[PDB]
Design an enzyme around this catalytic site. Structure first.
Site, PDB file in Angstrom:
ATOM      1  N   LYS A   1       0.814  -1.211   0.000  1.00 53.46           N
ATOM      2  CA  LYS A   1       0.000   0.000   0.000  1.00 53.46           C
ATOM      3  C   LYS A   1       0.848   1.262   0.000  1.00 53.46           C
ATOM      4  O   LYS A   1       0.454   2.268  -0.600  1.00 53.46           O
ATOM      5  CB  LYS A   1      -0.934   0.010   1.210  1.00 53.46           C
ATOM      6  CG  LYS A   1      -2.281  -0.653   0.992  1.00 53.46           C
ATOM      7  CD  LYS A   1      -2.826  -0.348  -0.391  1.00 53.46           C
ATOM      8  CE  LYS A   1      -4.337  -0.267  -0.375  1.00 53.46           C
ATOM      9  NZ  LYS A   1      -4.871   0.413  -1.588  1.00 53.46           N
TER      10      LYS A   1
ATOM     11  N   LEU B   1     -14.226  -3.614  -0.410  1.00 59.03           N
ATOM     12  CA  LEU B   1     -12.979  -4.350  -0.286  1.00 59.03           C
ATOM     13  C   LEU B   1     -11.959  -3.847  -1.296  1.00 59.03           C
ATOM     14  O   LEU B   1     -12.304  -3.407  -2.396  1.00 59.03           O
ATOM     15  CB  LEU B   1     -13.214  -5.846  -0.487  1.00 59.03           C
ATOM     16  CG  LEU B   1     -14.158  -6.515   0.509  1.00 59.03           C
ATOM     17  CD1 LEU B   1     -14.281  -7.992   0.205  1.00 59.03           C
ATOM     18  CD2 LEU B   1     -13.672  -6.296   1.927  1.00 59.03           C
ATOM     19  N   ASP B   2     -10.690  -3.917  -0.911  1.00 62.34           N
ATOM     20  CA  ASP B   2      -9.599  -3.526  -1.787  1.00 62.34           C
ATOM     21  C   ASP B   2      -9.341  -4.613  -2.830  1.00 62.34           C
ATOM     22  O   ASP B   2      -9.955  -5.683  -2.819  1.00 62.34           O
ATOM     23  CB  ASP B   2      -8.338  -3.258  -0.970  1.00 62.34           C
ATOM     24  CG  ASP B   2      -7.421  -2.248  -1.624  1.00 62.34           C
ATOM     25  OD1 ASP B   2      -7.913  -1.184  -2.056  1.00 62.34           O
ATOM     26  OD2 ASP B   2      -6.211  -2.532  -1.726  1.00 62.34           O
ATOM     27  N   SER B   3      -8.424  -4.318  -3.756  1.00 62.58           N
ATOM     28  CA  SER B   3      -7.992  -5.330  -4.717  1.00 62.58           C
ATOM     29  C   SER B   3      -7.282  -6.480  -4.017  1.00 62.58           C
ATOM     30  O   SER B   3      -7.533  -7.653  -4.322  1.00 62.58           O
ATOM     31  CB  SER B   3      -7.079  -4.701  -5.768  1.00 62.58           C
ATOM     32  OG  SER B   3      -7.639  -3.509  -6.285  1.00 62.58           O
TER      33      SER B   3
ATOM     34  N   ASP C   1      -7.724  -7.419  -0.983  1.00 60.61           N
ATOM     35  CA  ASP C   1      -8.732  -8.175  -0.246  1.00 60.61           C
ATOM     36  C   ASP C   1      -9.340  -9.265  -1.116  1.00 60.61           C
ATOM     37  O   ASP C   1      -9.461 -10.419  -0.691  1.00 60.61           O
ATOM     38  CB  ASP C   1      -9.819  -7.237   0.270  1.00 60.61           C
ATOM     39  CG  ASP C   1      -9.325  -6.322   1.364  1.00 60.61           C
ATOM     40  OD1 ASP C   1      -8.270  -6.623   1.952  1.00 60.61           O
ATOM     41  OD2 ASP C   1      -9.991  -5.304   1.640  1.00 60.61           O
TER      42      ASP C   1
END
Ligand code: SF4
Ligand code: SF4
Lengths: 114, 96, 176, 208, 113, 82
Positions: free
Chosen positions: A54, F38-40, F42
């Site tokens: 991130k 949700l993220d990628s 995730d």
């Protein structure tokens, strides 16, 4: 403006390479925790992996992210084989480092650093 | 050199060589530790006349490299040098 | 211009063959090595009796640093900072100011003996022979901080070792 | 100029100029510059795409026979837009000669690896990647070779400071060797030793 | 002469150097016949290979052939002929007689900066 | 693995085992990027949970198009007999 690619022609294959590297790191984190006798849990290691991905997630150049995937692959290979010691694995977690103040007032109190 | 003659003989027999001719322990044969003072010579530039520095400036004769080809007939092929000569066997000790 | 190490063909007649086979069966060269090590046993060893006997040295020897004086009590260093400029390890720190009678003298002269590589550039860059590398070498300390010399320590070393440093300089100064 | 000046070799200069013409005429597709120095050293500056053909020609030609690779180096010159200059030093035992082949690349463009020509290039350009961050495409096993296992940054670049960003010390609370931000008891003193007067007029650059 | 050992490790002694060298030089000539005539590589390599082939064909003995070829042993001469053939095929594939691929920037080879 | 109801129940159960996603809003036709947010990554580790629990690997070609649990159920029904 045409430049020579490294591995990825555009952003899609670069994103696939990022995805594969994240999958490999996520798979290896339990074995890294077990083999090195680390004091952290598997969840903390996976959170560190996600935190690094991130942190490094504002880049849009395919060659830059190709080099980032290459360096991550070197780190993963460096960890899969026992070349790093426990100190190299634990250097990602700054346990002995003092907490750096962030707001203006504490930085004003402690020194001249902006 | 303080060894007895019997020990010298046994030493020379077991070694196979005359060890007393070439002793590895140094004795009074070396030069003294106090020497008379020297008088070192001067170089060729220690002259009072015809000693202009512009006539012997080594660093100022250095030139920038000469550009042979830049991108800004039946001539013979050229090697970087004449081919190296074959080495001759040693006349002193050829081990042959 | 060149020679052929290990290009000797072995002879194949019965004399050479029986010599090699007898050397194999009776272990001749092993006896040769044993006998020569035995001969080396009966020699006087080259060991000197430290600390009662010291290894030889030269007047050019580079050991502990010292600050010298003129033969009138006045110190020789005039704070020109050439020694700290030429120091390849940056082991010398110099701070200067004019003293009471207007002389150009140092107020701080530190040498880090853990940074110094004992190369002797400072004693040859000095125009007045103030800084020297004395002949002392047995100055091991039990603490890291004892190896951080200030001006007073170097002046004390000079006053301690003047009677030898001056003689070494007198012996060697014609080679410089 | 006899005793204290280095004597000049002119036969070697003529031979090296002739061989530089020979090479630059055989390979016009990649060769950009050919120069011969004052002390008789031949440098051939080429395009980065022709690293494999130029090196293979110099290795395999009957009039070149540059069978030995002595040294492989990168040089960091930050003012150029292709800041990295990759230098190959070759030695020819047949003709008793040496040559220099130079190319250029920046941070993001890879260079074709020359392991398939010279086998010393493996460790040499592994070290080049470790110290300058220059990626070499088609390498057998490219990793770090001299730096620490967790080291971040390429130290031989000129924007990297002399002392790094981290330092090691042993911590008793975690019973481990740890890396911390660098703090020096005495700062490295910078010296401005450049003379304000021109030394060599022969290397004078023209004004803008 | 039937030399027992060439002196270099891993370099086997050639029993028939003349036939091997003639075959290699003719093969180099046929390979080089595909390169365009205006290419300088073809002209230079044809010239040197024709000189070597004439020298090999004009000498039946090997020791004087080795002496006048100026290449050490005859086996390393055979090795260099093989390397030249490989280079000729690779240079057919690469085509480096074409004009320059790209000009460098303005101050690419300027030293000092 | 042999019935679609059991496949759906196993998929939905191991989706409830995922910590950072509430079970209340999770239905059979809920997106990942815009429904639960949700993220990628995730979705990436969700798919690795899919392979870890169902015993068959999923390549990166066909793991990019699994946004709702019905798509996952239908895909792993395609890869099996069912
Ligand atoms: S001997 Fe060399 S390294 Fe030591 S203080 Fe003198 S100049 Fe510096
Ligand atoms: S070079 Fe000599 S005079 Fe100059 S500062 Fe150093 S010790 Fe003093």
């Amino acid at each position: 403006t045409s430049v020579k690619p490294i591995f990825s022609r555009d952003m899609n294959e670069a994103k696939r390479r990022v995805r594969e590297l994240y999958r490999a790191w996520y798979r290896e984190v339990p074995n890294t925790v077990h083999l090195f006798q680390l004091d952290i849990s598997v969840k903390q290691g996976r959170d560190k992996v996600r935190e690094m991905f991130k942190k490094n997630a504002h880049v849009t150049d395919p060659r830059v992210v190709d080099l980032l995937v290459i360096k991550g692959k070197m780190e993963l290979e460096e960890t899969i084989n026992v070349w790093k010691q426990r100190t190299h694995v634990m250097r990602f977690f700054h346990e002995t480092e003092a907490p750096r103040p962030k707001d203006f007032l504490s930085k004003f109190y402690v020194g001249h650093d902006p | 050199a303080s060894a007895t003659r019997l020990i010298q003989g046994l030493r020379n027999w077991a070694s196979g060589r005359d060890l007393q001719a070439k002793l590895q322990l140094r004795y009074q044969e070396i030069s003294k530790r106090t020497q008379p003072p020297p008088k070192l010579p001067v170089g060729p530039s220690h002259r009072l006349s015809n000693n202009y520095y512009c006539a012997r400036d080594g660093r100022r004769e250095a030139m920038p490299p000469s550009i042979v080809m830049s991108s800004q007939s039946e001539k013979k092929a050229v090697s970087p040098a004449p081919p190296i000569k074959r080495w001759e066997l040693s006349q002193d000790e050829p081990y042959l | 211009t060149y020679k052929y190490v290990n290009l000797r063909e072995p002879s194949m007649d019965m004399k050479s063959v029986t010599d090699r086979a007898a050397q194999t069966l009776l272990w001749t060269e092993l006896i040769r090595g044993l006998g020569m090590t035995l001969s080396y046993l009966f020699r006087e060893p080259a060991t000197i009796n430290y600390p009662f006997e010291k290894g030889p040295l030269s007047p050019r020897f580079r050991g502990e640093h010292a600050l010298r004086r003129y033969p009138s009590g006045e110190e020789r260093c005039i704070a020109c900072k050439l020694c700290e400029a030429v120091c390849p390890a940056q082991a010398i720190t110099i701070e200067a100011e004019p003293r009471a009678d207007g002389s150009r003298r140092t107020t701080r002269y530190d040498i880090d003996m853990t940074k110094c590589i004992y190369c002797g550039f400072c004693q040859e860059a000095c125009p007045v022979d103030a800084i020297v590398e004395g002949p002392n070498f047995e100055f091991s300390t039990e603490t890291h901080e004892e190896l951080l010399y200030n001006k007073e320590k170097l002046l004390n070393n000079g006053d301690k070792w003047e009677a030898e440093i001056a003689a070494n300089i007198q012996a060697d100064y014609l080679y410089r | 100029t006899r005793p204290t000046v280095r004597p000049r070799n002119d036969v070697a200069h003529k031979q090296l100029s002739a061989f530089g013409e020979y090479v630059a005429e055989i390979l016009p597709k990649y060769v950009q510059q050919v120069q011969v120095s004052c002390f008789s050293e031949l440098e051939i500056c080429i395009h980065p795409d022709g690293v494999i053909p130029v090196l293979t020609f110099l290795r395999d030609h009957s009039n070149a026979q540059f069978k030995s690779l002595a040294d492989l180096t990168a040089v960091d010159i930050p003012t150029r837009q292709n800041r990295f200059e990759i230098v190959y030093n070759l030695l020819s035992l047949r003709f008793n000669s040496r040559i220099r082949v130079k190319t250029y690349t920046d941070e993001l463009t890879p260079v074709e690896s020359s392991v398939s020509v010279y086998k010393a290039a493996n460790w040499y350009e592994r070290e080049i990647w470790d110290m300058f961050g220059v990626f070499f495409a088609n390498h057998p096993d490219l990793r770090r070779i001299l730096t620490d296992y967790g080291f971040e940054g390429h130290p031989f670049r000129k924007d990297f400071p002399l002392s790094g960003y981290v330092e090691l010390r042993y911590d008793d609370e975690v019973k481990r060797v740890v890396a911390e931000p660098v703090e020096l008891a005495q700062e490295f003193r910078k010296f401005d030793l450049n003379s304000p007067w021109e030394a060599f007029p022969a290397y004078r650059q023209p004004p803008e | 002469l039937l030399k027992k050992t060439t002196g270099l490790v891993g370099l086997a002694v050639c029993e028939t150097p003349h036939e091997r060298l003639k075959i290699l030089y003719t093969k180099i000539l046929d390979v080089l016949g595909h390169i365009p005539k205006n290419a300088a590589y073809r002209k230079y390599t044809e010239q040197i290979t024709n000189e070597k082939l004439s020298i090999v064909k004009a000498e039946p003995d090997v020791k004087k052939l080795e002496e006048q070829l100026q290449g050490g042993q005859i086996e390393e001469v055979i090795l260099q002929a093989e390397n030249e053939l490989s280079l000729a095929r690779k240079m057919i594939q690469w085509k480096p007689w074409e004009p320059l691929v790209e000009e460098p920037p303005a101050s690419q080879w300027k030293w000092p900066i | 693995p042999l019935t679609l109801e059991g496949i759906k129940d196993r998929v939905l159960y191991v989706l409830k085992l995922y910590d950072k996603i509430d079970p209340e809003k999770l239905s059979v036709n809920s997106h990942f990027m815009k429904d639960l947010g949700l993220d990628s990554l995730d979705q990436v580790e969700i798919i690795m949970a899919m392979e870890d629990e169902f015993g068959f690997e999923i390549p990166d070609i066909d793991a990019e198009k699994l946004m709702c649990p019905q798509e996952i159920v239908d895909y792993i029904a395609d890869k099996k007999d069912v």
